[PDB]
Design a protein around this ligand. Sequence first.
Ligand SMILES: Nc1c(O)cc(-c2cccc(O)c2)cc1C(=O)O
Ligand SMILES: Nc1c(O)cc(-c2cccc(O)c2)cc1C(=O)O
Lengths: 279, 279
Amino acid sequence: HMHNYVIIDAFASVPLEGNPVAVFFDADDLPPAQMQRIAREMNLSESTFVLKPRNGGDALIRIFTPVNELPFAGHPLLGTAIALGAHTDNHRLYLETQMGTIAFELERQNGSVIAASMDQPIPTWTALGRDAELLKALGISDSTFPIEIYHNGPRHVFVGLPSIDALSALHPDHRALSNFHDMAINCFAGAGRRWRSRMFSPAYGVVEDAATGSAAGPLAIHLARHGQIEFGQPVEILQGVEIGRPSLMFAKAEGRAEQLTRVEVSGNGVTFGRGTIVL
Amino acid sequence: HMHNYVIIDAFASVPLEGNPVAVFFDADDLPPAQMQRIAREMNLSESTFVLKPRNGGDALIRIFTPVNELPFAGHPLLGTAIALGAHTDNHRLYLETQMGTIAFELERQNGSVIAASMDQPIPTWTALGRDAELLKALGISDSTFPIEIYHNGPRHVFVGLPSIDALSALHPDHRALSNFHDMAINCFAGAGRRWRSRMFSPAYGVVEDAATGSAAGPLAIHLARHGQIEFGQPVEILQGVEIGRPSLMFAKAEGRAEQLTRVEVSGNGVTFGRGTIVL
Ligand SMILES: Nc1c(O)cc(-c2cccc(O)c2)cc1C(=O)O
Ligand SMILES: Nc1c(O)cc(-c2cccc(O)c2)cc1C(=O)O
């Protein structure tokens, strides 16, 4: 009859930064066709719906873009975990998804969840094999590191820039980027612990994304494989600066390329708004 | 510090139909840069902000897409008027905008505003002069009536189809439509009092719009000029059927082509949700 929701800015501690997600509570009475229509009404990159668990977790989360359901998504799940922390006392939260149960660690101050860390699906990867085409679309001549495409649900391509200023100077041809289907293009630069990223994806319906949580795990793997960090070392990834939505993602990939044991992504989140819908 | 808002589905009486707009109340403390960031956060086609009047109206309304401020907009202003009716008793509402003061008549049942009628800016028009290009993009060979482009703030082109089934069968090339800048393409079919429309606008950031209120006045003028209705006769325009967002717009253009005295557009509206933001 009515549902409460919150809008969480994921990968931010300040409202209007990070990447929004709408989280709808007590959604068991909504058929998925209605969830999809609600996600379309809200028009945020994702709306999530909190449901009773079916396999021993704390809750089952269904994730919708304005057009389709997703089996996994990075910032939407982080924001959902932070939102649900307002309704539980547990330090760990186990959220069921189409792809299995994702474990979260919740960080609180005086009962308010301010951040969370999630274990991500372990990616696979290969060479993109379309380098000249992609580089032309981005407006540059070469990448620093190999142009590889990672799969953990979505697909994320990584193109390296020689400096943060070169990354900020990119002005991609978005029409040309639209020939890259079912993937996002992540451009990065930095050194040591601190990296900057920009993400562009016509395929996922975003000219430039603020905080691509599902790309943070893959980027940590990419940087470790290519010798810029070690496996087991965390990185800080700052995204969305150029578009006025700065977002901080932390990532770490444990093990070795051939036997990854854990891919962790963490971030702050903050409530932008709260409301109730009439169905 | 905090602001209340509502989500109104304009040109509908049932939630999840029509065209959403977010309406923020008591917005005088928000600088326009912050209004723009809020509109971007919400990501609805428009968010509006209710401000104290400056020229004798009931309120001043500022209208933002996720990217820029607009001087006028059809469904956003209808939805704002219906939303503000919850806070006033007056039968008429005078809303100041960048383009002057727009008069609304509010229709209530037991204190709830269920519909409103607005006087629109009087359009101007001319031939598009790009017929072959536009028809190719739409996938058809010819229009029924002359292909003319109307200006009332936005620009709206009208292409006529020989039957409602031919209108539903359109599958436009949206890449080709993107070469039509600063305008929307409205395709229509029908007879007598009852017309169907579909609107496509890469320029205004919408693949297919549910209810193009600023096009309804122009369509009434177009139909009267081309002899399908008389000036002074109202039409019912049903839009958004193919995309699952049916929307009913009523329109009437009084006078004659050379001396239009009033362009009225009316519709139902309904509250989808209500909430509060943290700034
Ligand atoms: N924002 C996203 C989006 O629009 C799409 C996907 C995606 C796409 C294909 C398969 C899949 O499992 C997920 C992921 C995200 C995300 O945030 O991770
Ligand atoms: N949805 C709209 C949109 O995205 C843009 C405009 C527009 C564009 C240019 C000039 C202007 O005055 C208005 C109007 C609307 C609307 O709803 O009427």
